[PDB]
Amino acid sequence: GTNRSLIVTTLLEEPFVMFRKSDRTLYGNDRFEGYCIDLLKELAHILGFSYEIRLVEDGKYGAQDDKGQWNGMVKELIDHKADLAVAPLTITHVREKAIDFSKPFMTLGVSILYRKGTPIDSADDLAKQTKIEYGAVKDGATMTFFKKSKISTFEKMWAFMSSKPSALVKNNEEGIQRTLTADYALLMESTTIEYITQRNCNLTQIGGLIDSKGYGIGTPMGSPYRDKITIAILQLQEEDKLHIMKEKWWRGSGCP
Amino acid sequence: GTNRSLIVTTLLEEPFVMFRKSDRTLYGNDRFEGYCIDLLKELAHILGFSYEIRLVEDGKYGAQDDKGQWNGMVKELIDHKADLAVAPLTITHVREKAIDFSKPFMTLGVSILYRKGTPIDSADDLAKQTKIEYGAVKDGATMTFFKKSKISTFEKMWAFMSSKPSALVKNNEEGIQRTLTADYALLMESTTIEYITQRNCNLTQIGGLIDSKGYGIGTPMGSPYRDKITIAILQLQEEDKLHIMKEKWWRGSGCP
Numbered sequence: 380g381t382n383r384s385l386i387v388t389t390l391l392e393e394p395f396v397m398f399r400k401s402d403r404t405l406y407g408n409d410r411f412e413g414y415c416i417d418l419l420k421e422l423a424h425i426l427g428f429s430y431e432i433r434l435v436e437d438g439k440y441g442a443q444d445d446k447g448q449w450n451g452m453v454k455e456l457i458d459h460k461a462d463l464a465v466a467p468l469t470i471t472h473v474r475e476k477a478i479d480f481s482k483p484f485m486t487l488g489v490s491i492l493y494r495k496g497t498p499i500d501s502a503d504d505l506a507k508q509t510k511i512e513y514g515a516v517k518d519g520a521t522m523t524f525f526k527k528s529k530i531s532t533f534e535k536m537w538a539f540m541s542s543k544p545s546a547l548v549k550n551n552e553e554g555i556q557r558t559l560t561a562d563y564a565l566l567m568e569s570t571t572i573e574y575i576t577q578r579n580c581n582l583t584q585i586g587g588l589i590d591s592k593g594y595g596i597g598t599p600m601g602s603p604y605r606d607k608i609t610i611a612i613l614q615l616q617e618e619d620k621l622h623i624m625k626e627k628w629w630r631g632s633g634c635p
Numbered sequence: 636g637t638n639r640s641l642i643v644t645t646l647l648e649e650p651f652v653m654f655r656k657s658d659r660t661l662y663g664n665d666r667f668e669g670y671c672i673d674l675l676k677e678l679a680h681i682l683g684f685s686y687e688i689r690l691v692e693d694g695k696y697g698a699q700d701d702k703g704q705w706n707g708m709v710k711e712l713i714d715h716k717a718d719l720a721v722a723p724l725t726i727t728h729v730r731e732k733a734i735d736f737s738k739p740f741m742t743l744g745v746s747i748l749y750r751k752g753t754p755i756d757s758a759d760d761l762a763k764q765t766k767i768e769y770g771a772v773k774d775g776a777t778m779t780f781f782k783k784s785k786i787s788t789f790e791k792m793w794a795f796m797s798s799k800p801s802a803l804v805k806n807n808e809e810g811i812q813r814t815l816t817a818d819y820a821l822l823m824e825s826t827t828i829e830y831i832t833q834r835n836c837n838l839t840q841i842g843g844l845i846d847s848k849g850y851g852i853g854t855p856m857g858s859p860y861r862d863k864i865t866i867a868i869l870q871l872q873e874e875d876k877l878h879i880m881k882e883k884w885w886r887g888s889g890c891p
């Protein structure tokens with residue numbers, strides 16, 4: 380109880396959480412690597428706790444349906460089926476009504492991922508047409524941002540996204556594949572766009588950031604672990620350790 | 636320590652925290668009333684704690700200067716000079732890097748307060764001119780939102796606000812007075828606009844909400860009181876007690 384391993388919910392999302400490469404069949408925690416796994420390992424070392432990582436069954440981050448029921452990792456935390464959600468889980472006002480978060484470990488904002496070609500320059504350019512289809516990950520923070528916005532441009536965008544079946548994708552990977560195979564722009568969080576555009580040289584960020592917010596480790600509301608994790612994060616940041624950790628996982632061969 | 640009274644920092648802001656009317660000279664906690672004081676009293680009753688309310692000396696909510704130093708209630712918490720900030724303190728990503736917050740007790744967004752007269756309809760209308768001056772409370776969340784925005788309209792607005800000495804006001808009260816005496820629009824949080832426009836019938840909200848976020852009780856990072864306060868808030872909300880509390884302090888004679 381005071382000594383038990385913490386249950387960690389997560390999902391696969393490069394370069395935050397990935398299946399590490401091996402010839403063996405792997406099991407348990409050893410299956411996973413990435414920026415969020417490195418962060419978890421360092422926190423566990425600093426704070427003297429152990430854990431068991433489990434993939435969220437529905438593969439979702441989490442949003443509310445019309446009855447107010449949650450899904451994804453957010454629901455796992457609400458139900459106390461996990462102690463921590465270690466993932467690029469966006470800290471948002473709607474989620475803070477239901478779960479808690481550590482202090483942010485990374486800053487990001489919503490922006491646009493699109494193929495180099497048609498020289499659109501902002502969300503305003505997308506909103507005023509439909510030839511270039513656009514969308515977001517279903518039941519994530521970006522979708523919820525658009526759904527809740529009262530800014531005219533973004534209201535128009537939500538009207539389109541929410542009317543078009545194909546527009547909301549299962550996960551980043553599906554969305555990225557869609558930008559590569561169709562005339563489709565993905566509304567995506569900016570540090571992920573940074574990672575993707577360094578590796579897929581035909582993709583680019585369109586325009587700037589629409590907002591500026593954070594990823595945090597999610598916990599059930601009132602968790603006894605959340606504060607020590609926050610203080611440890613703060614201290615890692617004071618020493619630039621998270622910047623270094625980001626460089627490790629974002630580092631790579633650029634583009635021509 | 637386990638029994639000591641909590642130090643509460645606050646500032647005067649109608650109808651959240653006000654000096655109550657009396658013929659006597661009042662002292663101590665008895666000086667204060669309002670929505671946030673009612674919230675504090677209910678939490679203290681539920682949770683079995685006592686407190687001493689102190690007004691933040693600089694009268695500010697809190698923002699960072701160029702060296703990264705904070706002021707206002709945020710600085711009081713960082714310094715552990717207060718245990719709680721009980722006020723309409725906006726929960727923001729930049730603040731979450733330095734302090735913690737309870738779950739939100741109220742939802743709001745940035746909007747525009749302006750005199751009925753010139754029929755402007757949105758921030759876009761303000762941004763494209765300077766005849767109608769506009770601004771925000773200095774060293775509050777709204778100012779910081781504009782300062783950090785990369786949305787073109789809001790960048791233009793920040794360029795203007797930050798160049799014009801008179802534009803950033805000391806507090807809501809100064810800003811409201813300015814809308815009443817000059818051709819000036821105040822960027823203000825929406826539930827306060829709601830309160831003001833019910834009482835000053837010549838003022839109105841212009842356009843909709845630019846964002847949607849929360850007020851929370853601020854605490855130093857890692858506070859031992861923050862979780863129980865969060866759970867108590869949650870339970871007050873499940874029973875609609877905060878909606879009722881808002882109706883109490885926002886209730887009043889409408890306008891013609």
Ligand SMILES: N[C@@H](CCC(=O)O)C(=O)O
Nearest residue numbers: 440467468469519520521
């Ligand atoms: N990080 C997001 C998922 C990705 C997105 O919504 O763009 C979340 O926590 O919901």
Ligand SMILES: N[C@@H](CCC(=O)O)C(=O)O
Nearest residue numbers: 696723724725775776777
């Ligand atoms: N509630 C704001 C102050 C008012 C404003 O910035 O509009 C804050 O916590 O900074």
Ligand SMILES: [Cl-]
Nearest residue numbers: 432433434435
């Ligand atoms: Cl698993």
Ligand SMILES: [Cl-]
Nearest residue numbers: 616619621622
């Ligand atoms: Cl860092």
Ligand SMILES: [Cl-]
Nearest residue numbers: 688689690691
């Ligand atoms: Cl005082």
Ligand SMILES: [Cl-]
Nearest residue numbers: 872875877878
């Ligand atoms: Cl309520």
Ligand SMILES: [K+]
Nearest residue numbers: 382383384429
């Ligand atoms: K253990």
Ligand SMILES: [K+]
Nearest residue numbers: 401402403404
């Ligand atoms: K393998």
Ligand SMILES: [K+]
Nearest residue numbers: 638639640685
């Ligand atoms: K006491």
Ligand SMILES: [K+]
Nearest residue numbers: 657658659660
């Ligand atoms: K008096």
